[model samples]
Structure formats: C-alpha cells, structure tokens
Target: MLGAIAYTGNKQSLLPELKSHFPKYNRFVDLFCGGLSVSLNVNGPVLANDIQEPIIEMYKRLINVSWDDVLKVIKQYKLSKTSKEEFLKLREDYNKTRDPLLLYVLHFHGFSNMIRINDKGNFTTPFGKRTINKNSEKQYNHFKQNCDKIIFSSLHFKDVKILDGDFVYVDPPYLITVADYNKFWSEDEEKDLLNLLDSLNDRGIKFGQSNVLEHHGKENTLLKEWSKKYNVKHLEVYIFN
Candidate 1:
C-alpha cells in the first residue's frame, strides 16, 4: 500500500508471469516479501516474512491503519507538502518513540516518499514534496479491505518455516545490484538461500524465486549456474537502482 515505502526494483510488473509459474499451493509464503507485490495479490492464506524490522512493522501497521490518525499527525505537526523543518522534528520524535503511527506519517513527508532508518536505529529520512493526502487514504482503505488473509512475520528468510502445502516466493537482494537497501545480500546468503530452496524442493514443496542474472554488464554467474537446473523465464528486465 502507498507504494510500500517507495520501494524500487519493479516487482509489480512481474506478478502475472510469476503467478502463471506458481505451482498449485495450499498457502502462499512470501519469504522475502519485499513490497508485497506478490503476497497482497495472491489468493488463500499467506505468511509474509521480511528480514527488515521496520518494513514488516509498517505492513503490520497498514493492516490496522486508521487514516484519521495519519491526518491527525499531519495537523499536529503542521506539516506542509513542501516543508522540511517540521518534518525533521517529527523524525526526532519518531526516533525517540516506537509509535508506528509516527513512523508511518513520516514516510509521506520523506524524500521521494520513502523511509530509511540509520545504523543508529532512528528515522533519518529527509523531508520531501509529498505528504499524505486523500489519494493515500483511498489506497489504504483498498489495501486494508483485503489484508485479512495475511500473517506478517519479521524474520530472516532462512529462519522462516514452510510447510509442504505452501508455495514460497523468494525475492532476495540481487547479487548484481547496488541498492542502498538491498546491497546487504552477501554471496554467502545467496548460496545458502539457493540450497535452502533445494531443501524445499526435496521435501516436495512448491516454490518460485526472483533475482537478476545480469545487470550493467555484470552477471550473477552463480544464479545462472543454479537456474539451469530449473525452468527459467526471464522478466522484461529486472532493473534495480
């Protein structure tokens, strides 16, 4: 919802083809669930897991969101569409407290309508031209209406447990992308996750994964090598900036 913290790397476009690739599943499991482009669209029950704390927290908040409270915060802080100073105060206060509402409100006024927390575990996103408006209110209402099917989990993908009936979708950080948020995908994790998926296959579970094989003249050779063992259908072009 609300573009999911302005997450980049267009996974939304991959859904139809990805859905066609899905093996009939009793339940859907989104291991890396990034912006929830897959989870929110799929049918049946879903277990949405992400390693990031605040990202999943934001999703949790979204399920229980009350748009009035968002407007209340904007009014409370006198936030402006083109303002920066007032929004910084919200960042400081949001840092001081763990209120999801505060953090949620911060994103609308944040740079590029995105959220980011520093290594210090504080909200440090700068102000932007965007602010929560009627459009977001409508979007939130639409998303919430169908969110009853999701079960949110804030766990590393490896830590999540999957049953045989679940169809798992893994979209980890691309080994070849230089993203401020996704660069954390170490080669060790890449290898571990591939093996993990193998284990899932060995247990007769259904699964689909998303990753980039090449970018900017660089190639994820490991991904290329591993994918040869399965059905590989490339997206239009998985670009991450």
Candidate 2:
C-alpha cells in the first residue's frame, strides 16, 4: 500500500504477465515480497514475506490498524515543503524509535524512493522534493479491506515452508541490478536461491521467479544457464509442472 519509498526492483509492471501465467492454487507465496506489488495485485490467500522487518511490520500494522489511525500518524509530520533539516530530524527520531510511521514518512519523502540506511540502521537517504503522497489514504483504505486475506512474514526465502499446491512467486534482487537490497547479494547467494528453487522443482512445487538476465552491457550468466532447464516467460516467468 506504501506506493513509492524505493526499496528497489519492484515488479508492478510485470503483474499482467504474472497473472496471465499463474495457475490456480490454494495459496500464493511471495518469497521476496518487496513493496508487495505482486501480493497486493493477486487474489487468494497470500503469504507475503520479506527480509526487511520494517516493511513487513508496515504491512502487519496496516492489517491490524484502522486507516484513520494510520492517517493520524501521517498527519503528524509537516510533509509539505519539507526541508533537509526536518527530514534529518525525522530520520533521527525514526532511528531512535524505529517507528513504522516514521519509516514510511522517510521512504515516501526520501530521494528517488530510495531507502538507504547508515551502519547504525539510521535512514540516511536525503530529503526528496515530494509533498505528502495524496494517494496514501486511498491506498491504505483499499488495503485495509483486503488485509484479512493476506498474511505477513519477515523471513528469508529459504526459511519459508511452502506446502504442495501453493504457487510460489519470487522476485529476488537481481544479480546484476544496482539497488539498496542488492548490496549483500553475491554469486553465492544467487546460486543458493537458484539451487533452492531447483529443490522446490524437484518436489513438484510450482514456482515463478523474476530476474534480469541481461542489463546494461552485462549478463546474469548463472541465471541464464540455470533458467534454461525450465520454462521461461517474460519478467514474471514461471517454471510449473
């Protein structure tokens, strides 16, 4: 429901392709539920998981709290004509308190929708020239109505236990993309994720993974090689049995 606090590599555009290819299943599991683009768009029981606890917490809070209550939190900040000084102060307060609303404010107001935090876990993204996003309240209300259908989790993909017949949708950080989440991703991590998907495939679990096989004069050789064994569609490709 938080429209644009850049967590990087969102799949909002790929939903049509994903929805067209997705088969019927009892539940939908988003392994890398960044911003929940896929989960929010799709129907059915949803298990939306992400490694970032703050994001998951946001989802959880939205699910549990009233839309008006959330708006009250948003109302506390003077979002119009915000300055670096105010943003820095908010960021400091957010870091000290780890308030979910402050996190949302930082993301909504940060430059380029980026979520860059310092070593101390303080949000370091500079102030962006954005007024309070008007769409937030409407989006929050929309999510609130459908919130009961979704379950939020803060867990790694490997740790999530997927049962048979569940449709698993993974949009992991691309091996070659430059993003805040991609900082810790390496060849080994890439290999591990692919290998884990392979294990799921072996068990006849249906899964779809999105990645950039090619980017600005660069190639994801490992993903290209690995995906060859399965049916590859477009950005939201599925390898189903």
Candidate 3:
C-alpha cells in the first residue's frame, strides 16, 4: 500500500536492498518521491519531493479527506462493477473538476488501477475489470496511517532544502525503464541530476541514486560510467502482484 495510487511505484520492490544500504540519519529526504514506497517505508521523518504537483496534491487530499467520503464516492459510482460508460462519465467530470474523491474512484475502474493522464491533461486510463474488495479498506487504512508521517513538497530537486543529517536519495525517473513517464528522461536530465549528486557530496550530505543500468536489450551507459564513482549495489528485479 505504500504506493497504492499507481504512479512510478515499484520502489517497494527495492525496499530490502535500499534498507540495507540506507545510512542511519536524522531525516530521509526523497528527491523524486512521486513514488512513496521509499518514503513510506523509511523510519525517519521524511522530506518527500516530487516535481508533479498533482501527485503531491493527491496524497495531501487523501490525508485531509475522511474515509467515509471515499466510501461515498465508491457507493455512488457503483464501483463494484463500474461499466465503461459509468467510468467515463466520472472520468469526464474528474478531468473538469479534478475532484480528489472522483480521482480515487477512477483508479478502481482503471486498468489494473494504473493511473494515467493524457497530454491534454485528462485521466485517460481505459476501463478495467477491477472492483472494490474487502482488501481495499485495509489498503486505505495503511496509506492513511503512513502518509500522514510525510512532509511532502512539489519542487524540483535543486530547490528542495537539505539539512545537515539528511540522507537524500536522488531517485530520478529510471533512465532505462519502459514506464510511460520515462519517455522524456534524456541524457541531459540524467547528467544534471548526477551532477547535483556531486554537489551534494561537496556539501558533505550523504546521497544515493537508483536506476536500472539495462532493461529489455537496451542499456543506460551514462549511468554505468557515472556510478563507478560511488558504491553501487544491485537490486533484484521484482514486482508486486
């Protein structure tokens, strides 16, 4: 449930290796915390930043809203067997209003609960076969409990403030993954982010980064050569069911 909202998650898959290497620190600062898996699992106070404003807004909205309100939308939408027409109508209104409750309901009807937004700023995920289950309540409670512990931000990593004892993990989008969001991640962005880590080192702030060196016959040589300057630990590829 750490990243149940369907974003750049799967950081939960890397939790074991991350914890092993994570330094003991006063605060865990997550630079690209669009995925809350690391922030949610980490023990210390978290300074979680994501460049996407809506992503941070979703979490804040979830925390501020009552669980009963989420249930109200669920029941109103007949989320158990939400038809395509029903889902689209709700999606249409959600696009216009950006209502957090409607957005949450949309995920349940979306393909695998995969949140998707179009270039035109519409929630364009097609209708899926998922429905509310007894397990959903458990998942909701988990997020409600853990997300309240985070200090969220909608800032670029450069603008995120780092303190003396913070262990800042530079978790930019993977340079070599097939996620929809990784399409725009170029070498220049990778270089600048890597350079920012260098600057953090100069400030004596401990930092680490996570990226796949290779995927599906493609490789990220830029990350390969740059990571040699620091200790690199390999994480086993895994996925949540």
- Candidate 2 local lDDT, 1-241, one digit each (tens): 2332334667766677668888788899988888766777788799998887777776776655775665565566655555667677778899899877677766767887567765567777778876455575565666666667788899877789989888888888877777788765788888888888888888888888777778887888877788889888764244443
Better of 1 and 2 by lDDT: 1
Predicted model with the maximum TM-score? 1
Clashing pairs in 2: 6-113
Candidates' RMSD to native = 3.2, 2.4, 3.7
Q: Poorest 10 consecutive residues of model 3 by lDDT?
A: 232-241
What are the per-residue Cα lDDT tens digits for candidate 3 across 78-120?
6657477778888899999987667877887888777777766
Q: What is the total number of backbone clashes in candidate 3?
A: 0
Show where candidate 1 strays beyond 4 Å.
1-4, 236-241
lDDT of the structure predicted as candidate 3: 0.74
lDDT of each: 0.76, 0.73, 0.74
Whole-model lDDT, model 1 = 0.76
